Design a protein around this ligand. Structure first.
Ligand SMILES: COC1=C(OC)C(=O)C(C/C=C(\C)CC/C=C(\C)CC/C=C(\C)CC/C=C(\C)CC/C=C(\C)CC/C=C(\C)CC/C=C(/C)CCC=C(C)C)=C(C)C1=O
Lengths: 70, 108, 231, 46, 365
């Protein structure tokens, strides 16, 4: 979760009501459509790019300390 | 001149002994206050700190406390010879005489 | 369980388990005055006093951030001595080190003090974290005692004291309530209490006494698997 | 913000299943530590 | 007395392989409700010899599980039947578990006993939590030197006729024909005198056994047939470093070949550090070998036995969610997602613990 996801939720508050309360619990294709596009927290919502930067930043920074501490 | 004591800032007080009897009492109170000292009541003027669970590194902590209570600046060359209660008593006198004759503190 | 089988594991070209003077070609050789014109050497006889002042500094500079916690100052001292007593108690013959173990260890402790002077030594940051977690748990006990409430630690002691009475009231043939028996009683309670933290005791069943908790469960709608796919 | 729950299945009890509800907080806790550095660097960058 | 309880009965020769009942010793656990462990001793070997292993405070195995030291058919006090088909001998255990009201059990074995234990998991996996095999492998051992001696000794034992032979004639026969000290002692103690001192005989069926071994075909106990299949559940193998029965070089591959969940050496397969000694097969005698087996056994029972395949350890129960396959549930309005697999009570069928806890759950709400 992050602030940008929380902004979507405030904007999608009425949309969440229509899809989740009404559509998601119907039967038929209308239910399959609502349960599929259900609004909430992200499944597998992690961002590998952001995580990649964090790893290389920490790995490259430890090299700086060795190279600079002479 | 202030120090933390159990999370509270307390004003530190310095002592001025200028008397033999006051020195022997201060050192014993000092050595008996150290958590490593054994047989605190068996401690006397002629007690070897080694015989009470104290080593060279504990004499340093004691000297560090003498600077806190008296304001002295003890050099590293003088600490390793303080292995008895008698040694702290005689060193404290030599410092008081040096300042009373030379008008300055000994070389640190 | 498993022991090293190679008998020559601790063998070196300098002897068995020799980590003080490894064998090298350029070995130390003597010097003669009558034949020596000049020399460039860094060895001196100042390592002893540097070993003393280094202790006084590392001790006094660490206490600046203890906030007068007497119990922490005494604990830190025991840890500081364990760091300076390594050369005196080690298997390594520190008096036979290649070019002087005294200068080597002193120069090493000086690098630790430099980090201490900046309050950046990992032992310092580790001491702050360890102590804060301890005081948060001690203050929780204090807040519960001032309210007259019972601590989870006292409830165990009282539950263990009564179990000992029940177990010794039937131990009449013998009368040696060994420390072994006292121990397994406490561990059995700990294992049930340990599992109780994650699954508290709802009813007379006790801590972690519900089979239904171990039936098929699913992540809540509000917290799905963020790290990977689910199907 | 409150999230609408279709209530198709009952969510696990936080007391009995607490680890399932932790990841969300630690993620924001990471970001807050980063923001402390952004603010502390206002004078250096400026 | 109480902790040690071995049901008493007389062997019955059976013409039908389904009317076979198993008998053995039961070791009660320290605690009230514990899952059960069924352990099979070496062929022609006494169950009592394993009592000090399972009744040692240092190991404290009974603190974990109740132990059933059970004898297979044609061994010990159990019924007798010429067939040794692992499928038939496995059904015997399922009836015993039914007669004793055991829903599912942990299975163990020593040597050939390990095969019998693993066969039950291969034929009845839904009711077996784990398998712990000691100095055995699901492998053809007909040509192993250790088996040949056992196969050879059993054949020599067919020459003695207790009716005509005197007590001294027997003792002289064993020392000369049986060189191994342990096997010799095991066989001597297996000799028993029936009521009214009518005559002495072996507790095990010497005729049916020799035919199984002497014929030396697929049904032989040394053989492990492809018909036995694969074991789907938890399996841990422990054998001596220098063992005549399981050679570390190649006799570990059958475990991977037969057990699907076996990860490999260092995780589910271990060897005990030891010297070359033909007596290392009997780990329970030597403390050094036994201490490692017990520690590894207690670890398997505590953390690995009865744990779902895709979970690492018992610690992950309730905190690790397994992915679900699509279109695997009957409900059509089901949002497929990760789930923690269901782990049931060890005897949920023959008790009402679920019916009881359902009521208590309602009282909360
Ligand atoms: C200083 O010490 C050092 C380190 O720290 C120790 C290092 O880690 C390192 C190593 C360096 C790294 C680990 C970084 C690696 C990064 C690399 C290789 C490049 C990464 C490139 C990307 C992730 C792609 C980015 C692509 C885009 C931003 C384009 C898409 C976005 C668009 C078009 C949005 C428009 C953006 C702007 C107008 C810029 C304004 C900035 C904003 C934050 C506005 C954001 C606005 C919104 C609405 C979110 C070094 C060299 C170093 O010197």
């Amino acid at each position: 979760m992050n602030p940008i996801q929380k902004a979507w939720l405030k904007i999608l508050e009425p949309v969440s009501y229509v899809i989740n309360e009404k559509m998601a619990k119907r039967t038929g294709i209308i239910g399959k459509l609502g349960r599929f596009f259900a609004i909430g927290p992200r499944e597998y919502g992690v961002h590998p790019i952001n995580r990649m930067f964090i790893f290389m930043n920490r790995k490259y920074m430890a090299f700086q300390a060795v190279a600079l501490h002479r | 001149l202030t120090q933390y004591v159990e999370g509270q800032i307390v004003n530190r007080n310095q002592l001025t002994l200028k008397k033999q009897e006051d020195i022997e009492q201060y050192v014993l109170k000092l050595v008996r206050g150290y958590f490593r000292t054994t047989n605190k009541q068996g401690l006397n003027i002629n007690s070897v700190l080694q015989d009470h669970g104290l080593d060279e590194f504990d004499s340093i902590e004691l000297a560090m406390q003498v600077e806190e209570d008296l304001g002295y600046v003890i050099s590293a060359e003088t600490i390793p010879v303080l292995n008895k209660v008698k040694h702290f008593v005689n060193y404290i006198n030599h410092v008081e005489q040096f300042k009373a004759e030379n008008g300055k503190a000994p070389i640190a | 369980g498993y022991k090293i089988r190679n008998k020559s594991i601790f063998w070196t070209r300098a002897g068995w388990k020799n980590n003080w003077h490894p064998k090298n070609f350029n070995a130390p050789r003597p010097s003669y005055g009558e034949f020596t014109m000049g020399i460039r050497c860094r060895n001196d006889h100042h390592s002893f006093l540097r070993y003393v002042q280094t202790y006084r500094n590392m001790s006094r500079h660490c206490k600046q951030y203890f906030l007068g916690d007497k119990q922490l100052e005494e604990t830190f001292i025991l840890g500081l001595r364990s760091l300076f007593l390594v050369p005196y108690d080690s298997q390594c013959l520190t008096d036979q080190i290649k070019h002087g173990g005294e200068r080597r260890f002193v120069d090493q402790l000086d690098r630790d003090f430099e980090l201490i002077s900046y309050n950046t030594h990992p032992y310092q940051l580790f001491t702050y974290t360890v102590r804060n977690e301890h005081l948060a748990w001690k203050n929780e006990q204090y807040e519960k005692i001032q309210k007259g409430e019972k601590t989870f630690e006292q409830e165990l002691l009282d539950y263990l004291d009564e179990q000992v009475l029940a177990e010794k009231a039937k131990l009449r043939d013998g009368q040696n309530f060994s420390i072994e028996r006292m121990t397994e009683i406490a561990l059995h309670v700990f294992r049930k209490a340990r599992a109780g933290k994650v699954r508290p005791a709802q009813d007379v069943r006790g801590p972690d006494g519900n089979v239904n908790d171990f039936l098929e469960q699913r992540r809540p709608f509000e917290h799905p698997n963020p790290t990977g796919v689910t199907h | 913000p409150k999230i609408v729950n279709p209530q198709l299945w009952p969510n696990p009890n936080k007391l009995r299943f607490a680890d399932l509800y932790k990841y969300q907080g630690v993620e924001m806790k990471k970001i807050n530590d980063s923001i402390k550095n952004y603010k502390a660097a206002k004078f250096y960058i400026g | 007395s109480r902790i040690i309880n071995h049901l008493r009965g007389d062997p019955v020769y059976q013409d039908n392989t389904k009317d076979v009942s198993l008998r053995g010793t039961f070791l009660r656990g320290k605690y009230d409700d514990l899952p059960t462990m069924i352990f099979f001793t070496e062929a022609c070997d006494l169950t009592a010899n394993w009592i000090p292993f399972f009744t040692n405070p240092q190991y404290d195995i009974l603190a974990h599980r109740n132990v059933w030291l059970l004898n297979p058919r044609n061994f010990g006090n159990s019924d007798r039947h010429p067939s040794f088909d692992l499928q038939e001998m496995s059904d015997d255990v399922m009836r015993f578990m039914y007669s004793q009201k055991i829903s599912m059990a942990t299975l163990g074995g020593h040597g050939i006993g390990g095969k019998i234990a693993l066969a039950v998991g291969c034929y009845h996996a839904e009711r077996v939590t784990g398998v712990f095999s000691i100095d055995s492998s699901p492998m053809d051992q007909r040509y192993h030197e250790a088996f040949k001696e056992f196969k050879g000794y059993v054949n020599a034992l067919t020459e003695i006729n207790f009716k005509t032979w005197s007590d001294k004639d027997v003792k002289v026969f064993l020392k000369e024909n049986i060189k191994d000290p342990k096997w010799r002692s095991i066989f001597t103690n297996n000799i028993s005198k029936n009521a009214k001192t009518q005559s002495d005989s072996f507790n095990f069926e010497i005729n049916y056994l020799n035919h199984n071994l002497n014929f030396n075909k697929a049904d032989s106990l040394g053989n492990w047939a492809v018909k036995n299949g694969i074991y789907t559940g938890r399996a841990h193998f422990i054998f001596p470093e220098y063992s005549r029965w399981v050679h570390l070089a190649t006799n570990t591959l059958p475990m991977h070949k037969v057990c699907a969940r076996v990860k490999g050496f260092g995780h589910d397969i271990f060897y005990v550090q030891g010297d070359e000694n033909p007596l290392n097969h009997w780990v329970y005698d030597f403390e050094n070998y036994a201490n490692v087996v017990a520690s590894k056994l207690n670890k398997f029972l505590h953390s690995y036995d009865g744990v779902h395949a895709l979970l690492k350890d018992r610690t992950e129960i309730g905190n690790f969610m397994i992915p679900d396959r699509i279109k695997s549930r009957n409900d059509s309005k089901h949002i497929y997602g990760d789930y923690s697999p269901a782990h049931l009570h060890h005897n949920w069928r023959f008790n009402h613990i679920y019916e009881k806890h359902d009521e208590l759950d309602k009282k909360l709400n």
